[PDB]
Design a protein around this ligand. Structure first.
Ligand SMILES: O=c1cc(C(F)(F)F)[nH]n1-c1ccccc1
Length: 209
């Protein structure tokens, strides 16, 4: 059972700007997703300080980067706080309407796409490199859900019958045909070292057969 939703008009506009603007510095999508994962991990860590049972769903706080050249996917997995169904529908837990407004004012006032995370909508930088994004998530207070969008103005939400996650979020990037450099180990390592060197959680880059 799949529910299809329209993006708010401002988010659709943000997504088409990300997709259509000529902008060569695409590698910053990975910094933005890792930063989102770090923020999610901070949230469950804070809640566990006063309630250790919040970690019954998984004690380890970490980030995995999983390239798969056969599927042409790069998956960013974290064991952070996760998202409820309502979070997913409400722009993946962001204040994306007001953040898009601020971001687009900044852009015509000098800024470039790389500053997107200062406006709280860094998730959407995934569409620099991905034709489709699937987000699988599990919050302690809800069931496991899958969000998906190929842009074009709509997204879907369904209950996820896939492999149970425990707690956290998995962002599966279905890469564009010409963006497969972000499946190569040396390229991913370079980007993590350049932009994510002070993330306070282990980032494990999986290797392939
Ligand atoms: O772990 C992740 C990954 C994302 C995403 F990149 F997809 F946006 N958000 N997120 C998060 C952040 C804070 C609270 C709950 C979930």
């Amino acid at each position: 059972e799949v529910e299809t939703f329209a993006f708010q008009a401002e988010i659709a506009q943000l997504m088409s700007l990300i997709i259509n603007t000529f902008y060569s510095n695409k590698e910053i999508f990975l910094r933005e997703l890792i930063s989102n994962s770090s923020d999610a991990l901070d949230k469950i860590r804070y809640e566990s300080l006063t309630d250790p049972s919040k970690l019954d769903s998984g004690k380890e706080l970490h980030i995995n980067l999983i390239p798969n050249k056969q599927d042409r996917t790069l998956t960013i997995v974290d064991t952070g706080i996760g998202m409820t169904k309502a979070d997913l529908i409400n722009n993946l837990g962001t204040i994306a309407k007001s953040g898009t407004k601020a971001f687009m004012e900044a852009l015509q006032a000098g800024a470039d796409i790389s500053m997107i995370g200062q406006f709280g909508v860094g998730f959407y930088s995934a569409y620099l490199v991905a034709e489709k994004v699937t987000v699988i998530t599990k919050h302690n207070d809800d069931e496991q859900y899958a969000w998906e969008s190929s842009a074009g103005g709509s997204f879907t939400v369904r209950t996820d019958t896939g492999e149970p996650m425990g707690r956290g979020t998995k962002v599966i990037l279905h890469l564009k045909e010409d963006q497969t450099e972000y499946l190569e180990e040396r390229r991913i390592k370079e980007i993590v070292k350049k932009h994510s060197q002070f993330i306070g959680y282990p980032i494990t880059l999986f290797v392939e057969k």
